Amino acid sequence: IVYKPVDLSKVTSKCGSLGNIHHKPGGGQVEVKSEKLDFKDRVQSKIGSLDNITHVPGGGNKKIETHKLTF
Amino acid sequence: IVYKPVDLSKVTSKCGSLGNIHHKPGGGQVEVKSEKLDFKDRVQSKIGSLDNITHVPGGGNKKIETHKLTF
Amino acid sequence: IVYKPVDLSKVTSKCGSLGNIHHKPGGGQVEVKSEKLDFKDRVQSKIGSLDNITHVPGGGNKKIETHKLTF
Amino acid sequence: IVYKPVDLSKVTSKCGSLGNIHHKPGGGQVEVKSEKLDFKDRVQSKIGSLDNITHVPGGGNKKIETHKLTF
Amino acid sequence: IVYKPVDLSKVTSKCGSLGNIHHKPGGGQVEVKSEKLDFKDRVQSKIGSLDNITHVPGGGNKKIETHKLTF
């Protein structure tokens, strides 16, 4: 019995913002005016002009390989 | 018995914003005026001019390989 | 019995902001004016012009290999 | 004056014996019998059953790029 | 004056015997019998069963790039 398997495989993930050229994203002027407001419960507030985000919870990679030989 | 399998496979994922050239997204002027507002429950608020986002929760990669030989 | 398996495979993940050229993200002018506001519960507030973020909770990599030989 | 040319071109040459599968060329039995031969000038002789050859004297690749800007 | 040229090009040559699978070239039996032969000048002789050759005198690669800016 002669057993000589070869793996040369590439198992790859490329995830997010990549290989990009000359990106010039512009946020404009943002004005928020708030007067005499009442909040009676929990508040979360975001005021921005530009968000650039790559999240990538994924992109995950998994290899299982399994050799059994028996006599 | 002679066993010599060969694997040269490429398992690949390319997910999100990639290989882009000259992107010039421009968010305009944003004005928010709020007066005398009453909120009796939880509030979440987002104000912004431009959002550039790549999420990629997926883009995952899985390889299962098995080689059982019996005599 | 002759057993000589060979693994030369590459398991890779490339996650986030990478290989980018000339990115010039520009946050605009941000103005927030607040008068006479009342909050009766927990508040969280984020004010900013530009956010550049790569989170990558993922991008994980797992390799299981096994070689059982029995006589 | 704004000058921002971008080149993403692929200049490629693929020359010879490539991407072939299961080639089994078989040269036959060759018998050469020579008796009482006379040679009065230079001799070059090749005897063989099978030749597999890729010459590729060419397959060359040339890229000339120029960017002159004047004021 | 703003000058920001970008080159991301690929200049490539792939020359010879490549990416081939399961090639089983077989030279046959070769017999050369020579008797009483007379040679009066330079001789070169090659006897063989199988020749597998990739020569590649070419496959060359040249890139000329120039960036002249004058004021």
Add this chain to the structure above:
Amino acid sequence: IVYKPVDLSKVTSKCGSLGNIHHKPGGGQVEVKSEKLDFKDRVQSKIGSLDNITHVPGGGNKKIETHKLTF
């Protein structure tokens, strides 16, 4: 004057015998019998069963880049 040229290009050559799988070249039986042969000048002789050769006199790579800025 603002000058920021970027080169990320790849200049590559892949020449010879490469990326091949399961090549099993087989030279056959070679027999050479010579009797009473006369040579009156220079002789060169090659006898063999199998020749496997990659020469690659070429496969060369040349890059000229120039950045002249004058005022």
